[PDB]
Amino acid sequence: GAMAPSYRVKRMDIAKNDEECVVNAANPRGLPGDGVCKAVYKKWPESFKNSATPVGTAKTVMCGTYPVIHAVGPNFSNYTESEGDRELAAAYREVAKEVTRLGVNSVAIPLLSTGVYSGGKDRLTQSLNHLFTAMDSTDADVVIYCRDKEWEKKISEAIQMRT
Ligand SMILES: O=C(c1ccccc1F)N1CCNCC1
Ligand SMILES: [Cl-]
Ligand SMILES: [Cl-]
Numbered sequence: 001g002a003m004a005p006s007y008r009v010k011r012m013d014i015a016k017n018d019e020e021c022v023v024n025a026a027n028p029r030g031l032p033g034d035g036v037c038k039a040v041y042k043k044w045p046e047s048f049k050n051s052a053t054p055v056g057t058a059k060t061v062m063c064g065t066y067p068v069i070h071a072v073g074p075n076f077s078n079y080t081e082s083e084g085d086r087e088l089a090a091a092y093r094e095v096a097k098e099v100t101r102l103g104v105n106s107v108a109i110p111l112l113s114t115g116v117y118s119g120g121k122d123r124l125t126q127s128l129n130h131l132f133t134a135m136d137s138t139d140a141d142v143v144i145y146c147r148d149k150e151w152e153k154k155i156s157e158a159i160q161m162r163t
Contacts, residue, residue, distance in 0.1 A: 001139030007159045011152040014145035015043040017108035026070035036110045056087035058094035073112030076119030092134035106141040
């Protein structure tokens with residue numbers, strides 16, 4: 001575990017992360033996809049061998065010795081708000097199980113079901129709070145990656161609020 005487990009946020013490509021493993025905002029079919037998923041495919045394509053997994057689950061595939069945790073958040077275009085909320089919470093619980101199983105001291109993680117799976121809604125707070133609910137009992141250093149300056153500010157505020 002980390003000596004003093006922390007949350008941090010960085011605004012940059014998660015393919016350039018400085019952590020011991022990465023969480024992919026994956027699709028259920030293990031396809032290259034768009035956004036984070038496409039960046040992850042370009043950097044770690046070997047990790048997409050048998051990475052298909054259902055919504056609300058996470059499946060780890062090693063790229064060399066570097067673990068890629070493929071976490072499938074719901075696409076809110078297809079799910080009701082209630083069912084999507086449940087599957088988004090579940091995906092993050094599976095990420096915490098995998099991070100624990102792997103024995104890593106740090107993990108790079110995007111906010112699941114934002115961007116093209118958001119169903120056109122701002123889900124920063126919903127997605128971040130489900131991330132915290134799952135990861136707070138883990139002792140890995142968590143580094144959240146985002147692309148928007150205003151999201152960086154809001155994630156940073158949410159982290160600092162609870163310290
Ligand atoms: O997830 C969203 C989003 C999607 C649909 C509606 C509002 C939104 F803030 N982001 C905004 C652009 N940067 C990526 C994060
Ligand atoms: Cl970058
Ligand atoms: Cl973002």
